[PDB]
């Protein structure tokens, strides 16, 4: 939302000094006169930033900082004296700043200001290659800071590295100058034996690696992968990568950005990964959500090779209809509330599919009409507002 | 067989989940039809189309 709106106009300046901002066409110097959109996406880059002061000085430091906030204020709160102590309760940004430097020993101020000062988001594109010879990745990772929104990064950046021997995160120093960044890469053992290949987390899973490159050992890369910086990341992976980083990931938002990855690939192996994902329950529910929108764009685009019935359908009728008879639907049941969420998002997907004369096919029409005929809420103890709602939709 | 002795018949029964689905479903649809159509005939009345 707030790279979106930044990089729409100009950018949101938390703190200004008094104009500070005047590539916009308010001003910034009281809340009355901030567009409201302004006023959103000011609260929305404040606890970002926030998030950003507990990445550098931990959690337990942020909660200390905020309890000497409110002890200070409740110890000014029971005073009698007309303000001798209550502008105890008046907090400012240098106080803030003065109590975090008390806590932690630390101060945040080249944070404070990169991030709160200086009104902008960064923009990275990134690209690897890998060097078989000297066995070593290198990147890539160049920023457009010419853009009205943007500004430079020249601070650190975390790259997580996904090989056959496992995830290993790796700082790069982004200086102005900087452009190719070689880190190095592990072995290849795991494809001479089988053995399971180690993940982010402590658990290790059996993967297809018939897609792989021979001579590369990594699976996928994830630049800036904890939403450490004010972002926005193209990074330039293979097919298969996204296709690896869909399923076997165990982070959402790197399934949610191979899923926004894979609609530029439509081939078979990617309607595989989206397809494998849909029917996977322990995924996130709202990655599957996705994933349903993800196929039926995939599916508009590789018309005139599709072979078997329209996408999801055959999905739908395993999950949700009927064993005997697969065009009934069963009774609606909406205690589980992820396959109900699902079940209500995956008509509203399989209605983008479109024939090769550009119009929607009569079999996913009529399988919506026949959802809606057989339709029977006598049973479950929840309402049906919302599932009908979508499908109208 | 039939002279003297007698064992009664009944009704075939219809114990079959798809039409029992079908007939719940279209007696629902078609009641639902006839409400509306009754409610918007004997009220004040919009229409999508040019006097329709």
Redesign the interface.
Known sequence: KIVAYELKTGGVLLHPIFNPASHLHFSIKHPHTLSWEYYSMFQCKAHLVMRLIENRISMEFMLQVFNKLLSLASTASSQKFQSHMWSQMLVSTSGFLKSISNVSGKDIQPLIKQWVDQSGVVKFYGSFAFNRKRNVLELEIKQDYTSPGTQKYVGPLKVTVQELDGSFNHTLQIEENSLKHDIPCHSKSRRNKKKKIPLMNGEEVDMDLSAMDADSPLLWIRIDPDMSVLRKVEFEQADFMWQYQLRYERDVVAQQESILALEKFPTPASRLALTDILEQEQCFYRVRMSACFCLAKIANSMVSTWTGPPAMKSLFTRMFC?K??PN?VKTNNFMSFQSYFLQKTMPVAMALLRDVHNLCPKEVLTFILDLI??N?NRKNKFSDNYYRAEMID | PHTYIKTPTYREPVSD??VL??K???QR?DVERALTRFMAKTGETQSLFKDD
Request: one cysteine or more; glycine letters at 0%.
């Open positions: 009927c005997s008879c009934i005929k057989y029977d | 989940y798809q689905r079908e719940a479903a279209s649809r």
